[PDB]
Amino acid sequence: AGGRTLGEQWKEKLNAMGKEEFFSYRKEAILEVDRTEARRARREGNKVGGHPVSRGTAKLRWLVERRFVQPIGKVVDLGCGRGGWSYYAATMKNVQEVRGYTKGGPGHEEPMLMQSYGWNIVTMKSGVDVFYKPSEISDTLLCDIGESSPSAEIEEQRTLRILEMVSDWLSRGPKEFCIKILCPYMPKVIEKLESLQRRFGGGLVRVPLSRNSNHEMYWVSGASGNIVHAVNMTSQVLIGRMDKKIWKGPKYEEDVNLGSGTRAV
């Protein structure tokens, strides 16, 4: 097929949007968690109330509850940030260890020290650029890296780089995985994904907690099916939410409770 993909058309229409229109559209009909108590928790220094460190936790929870991924054994979390995913994985029955890597530093999130349930099996290391980290054995591989750009070409290249690095870690045998695809609608990214699906399996899913201001999808081990179809479906939904007559806003949802306490190691 010649011409632009649907996702590229979405991207173009998104780039043309004015400030006010962008912030209404961003959350139109999306799923959102109420982070109010988690923000007050952060500022009180409450590490034992079960409040997630970020909105990421809820996204991994959406996926795990639908069995799109089932964390087990040694979990590696690439781009762990504050630890939203690392700490949620540590709450999972058959997870034994969680190792998170993240760059940190100015402008970026440092891992937060929490006492959510299983906190004692989490080890997050800041100051790590994963593109230069030699792969290690894992049973579960998580990766939540992807910096946005108005250019789909710049996003395409970013995504491919992630896919190349992710393929390394996947070749070390993890059968459970969950990987953010920044820009899944560009032809080269599709080509690579389709190849990766042949070798490692899985499928691409859109998480409804994602904002309409991005087209991020997760390549997850528990999913299957035609990648092109899944992607186009998302483009169509995101486009269908554009140019709304009246903005109804997001559907709110309760945040995840991660509890507290250590677990047997």
Ligand X SMILES: Nc1ncnc2c1ncn2[C@@H]1O[C@H](CSCC[C@H](N)C(=O)O)[C@@H](O)[C@H]1O
- Residue 96's contacts (CB-CB under 8 Å, 6 or more residues apart) are 73, 74, 121, 265
Which one, 38 or 145, has the nearer CB to ligand X? 145
| 102 annotated as a binding-site residue | yes
| 218 annotated as a binding-site residue | yes
Written as one letter, the residue type at 105 is: G
Q: Which residue is nearest to ligand X (CB)?
A: 56
Which one, 5 or 181, has the nearer CB to ligand X? 181
Positions 112 through 171 that interact with ligand X (CB under 6 A): 128-131, 144-145
Residue range at the interface with ligand X (CB under 6 A); choices 4-12, 65-73, 97-105, 151-159: 97-105
Q: How far apart are CA 59 and CA 93, in angstroms?
A: 19
Distance of closest approach, residue 148 Cβ to ligand X, in angstroms:
11
Q: Quickly count: other Cβ atoms within 10 Å of residue 84's Cβ.
A: 27
- Phi-psi category of residue 162: left, alpha or beta, with phi > 0 → left and psi -120 to 50 → alpha: alpha
Distance of closest approach, residue 136 Cβ to ligand X, in angstroms:
14
If one asks whether residue 61 binds ligand X (CB under 6 A), the answer comes out as no
Residue count, binding to ligand X (CB under 6 A):
21
Which one, 5 or 86, has the nearer CB to ligand X? 86
If one asks whether residue 111 binds ligand X (CB under 6 A), the answer comes out as no
Q: Quickly count: other Cβ atoms within 10 Å of residue 50's Cβ.
A: 20
Alpha carbons within 13 A on the beta-carbon side of 129: 4
* DSSP label of 169: H
| 105 annotated as a binding-site residue | no
Q: How far apart are CA 199 and CA 55, in angstroms?
A: 31
Distance of closest approach, residue 206 Cβ to ligand X, in angstroms:
17
Residue range at the interface with ligand X (CB under 6 A); choices 15-23, 80-88, 166-174, 225-233: 80-88
Binder to ligand X among 5, 57, 91, 210 (CB under 6 A)?
Answer: 57
Q: Quickly count: other Cβ atoms within 10 Å of residue 112's Cβ.
A: 17
Catalytic residues: 59, 144, 180, 216
Q: How far apart are CA 15 and CA 215, in angstroms?
A: 13
Q: Quickly count: other Cβ atoms within 10 Å of residue 165's Cβ.
A: 18
Residues of each annotated binding site for S-adenosyl-L-methionine: 54, 84-85, 102-103, 129-130, 145, 218
Q: Name the site residues for ligand X (rule: CB under 6 A).
A: 54, 56-57, 79-85, 101-103, 108-109, 128-131, 144-145
